[PDB]
């Protein structure tokens, strides 16, 4: 009776303490993993300054990667990315082509194997378990060039600010398959560069697009990790204010039941004493 609402008040009060702790844990994790995000932002732009940005290519085999998070209190992030993943995956599929869908983070595997299970070949988790490093992104990219696709769409949340996390799609073209061909206009746009490497340009572009896939995959999971912490910092803020509004309502209900209990027990005592007096 009047004991259940008391322990329920205690439960909501400790949940509010827990979420206020988790909010500033995510605040500390966002504040330290922000400098790494801004440092990794430099290397992605010489390739898009060199190779450009060609999302709307016509490919025949394509690997689409959804960079999600691992822990599940992100508050509307991984659902946003699995929305954008099929929103751009249906946009670039009108040619009767092959698609391999890959997820980084097992909350992507909990959300993508029910929406595209026909095309889902790979699930990569435990990536943020200590930190993300370039050799880790390199191994993941080597698993992506295990298949031999013509393009790579990478879906992640760019850490724009501590409140805004723009979901982006980054595109990497296979060297011999589309990279020389999506630069062809009045000859070629890559012929202005004088190759100073060992072997021919079909291997320089191979090394460069493997490097470019690894670099944008490193920056993808790093930006997505910072936005995952920064959105968990806001979701736990909403959780504290919700478990504070709930505590403030349930305390008023407890005070009403408290006053009602004292009144009805006293009316029982007076009614039992007036029958004898």
């Amino acid at each position: 009776s009047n004991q259940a609402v008391k322990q329920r008040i205690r439960a909501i009060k400790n949940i509010g303490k827990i979420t206020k702790a988790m909010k500033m844990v995510a605040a500390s994790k966002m504040k330290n993993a922000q400098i790494a995000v801004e440092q990794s932002r430099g290397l992605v732009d010489p390739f898009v300054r060199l190779f450009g940005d060609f999302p709307a290519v016509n490919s025949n085999k394509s690997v689409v990667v959804a960079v999600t998070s691992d822990k599940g209190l992100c508050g509307g992030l991984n659902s946003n990315i699995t929305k954008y993943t099929r929103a751009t995956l249906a946009t670039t599929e009108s040619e009767g082509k092959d698609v391999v869908v890959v997820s980084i983070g097992d909350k992507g595997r909990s959300q993508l194997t029910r929406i595209e299970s026909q095309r889902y070949q790979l699930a990569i988790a435990d990536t943020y378990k200590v930190r993300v490093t370039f050799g880790q992104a390199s191994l993941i990219v080597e698993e992506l060039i295990k298949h031999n696709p013509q393009s790579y769409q990478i879906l992640f949340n760019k850490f724009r600010s501590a409140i805004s996390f723009k979901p982006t799609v980054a595109t990497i073209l296979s060297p011999d398959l589309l990279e020389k061909q999506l630069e062809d206009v009045t000859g070629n746009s890559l012929d202005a560069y004088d190759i100073e490497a060992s072997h021919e340009r079909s291997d320089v572009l191979r090394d460069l697009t493997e490097f470019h896939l690894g670099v944008t995959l490193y920056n993808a999971m790093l930006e997505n990790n910072c936005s995952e912490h920064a959105s968990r910092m806001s979701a736990m803020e909403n959780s504290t204010k919700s478990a504070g509004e709930m505590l403030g309502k349930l305390t008023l209900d407890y005070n009403r039941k408290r006053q009602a209990t004292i009144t009805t027990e006293l009316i029982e005592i007076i009614a039992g004493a007036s029958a004898l007096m």
Binding site: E268, A271, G272, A275, L276
Partner: protein, 141 residues
């Protein structure tokens, strides 16, 4: 899950419109279904005590029992809501005295005191109007 025994008192407790009467009715109907099968002394004779219920519900229940043939073994004691509070108070004892005939004479009885939460309210009415001092929720001691 909660198997009854033959001399066991099992409480059917719940909130309103959750199916307490329904569990009791399936007990009585199943005893009709098994009485036509066992040799003459494993037969269970039911008594339904309907305290405080409205007279329409008792009419529906008698209609159901007589259309399923379960009224051959069932007594129904019916102290409805318009009856005086001593009749609702006393109808579980009347029904238990009717069903104790089968217990005392080697047969097997089964009794349902449907709305025993209403016999206590009728007893509280009698005891408060006989000016006995009230207690918890003004119930008697």
């Amino acid at each position: 899950l909660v198997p009854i025994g033959r001399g066991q008192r099992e409480l059917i407790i719940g909130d309103r419109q959750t199916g307490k009467t329904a569990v009791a009715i399936d007990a009585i109907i199943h005893q009709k279904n098994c009485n036509e099968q066992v040799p003459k002394a494993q037969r269970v004779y039911c008594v339904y005590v309907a305290v405080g219920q409205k007279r329409s519900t008792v009419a529906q229940l008698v209609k159901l029992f007589t259309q399923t043939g379960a009224m051959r073994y069932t007594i129904m004691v019916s102290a409805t809501a318009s009856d005086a509070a001593p009749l609702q108070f006393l109808a579980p004892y009347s029904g238990c005295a009717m069903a104790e005939y089968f217990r005392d004479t080697g047969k097997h009885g089964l009794i349902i005191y449907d709305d025993l939460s209403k016999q206590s309210v009728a007893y509280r009415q009698m005891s408060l109007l006989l000016r006995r001092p009230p207690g918890r929720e003004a119930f008697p001691g």
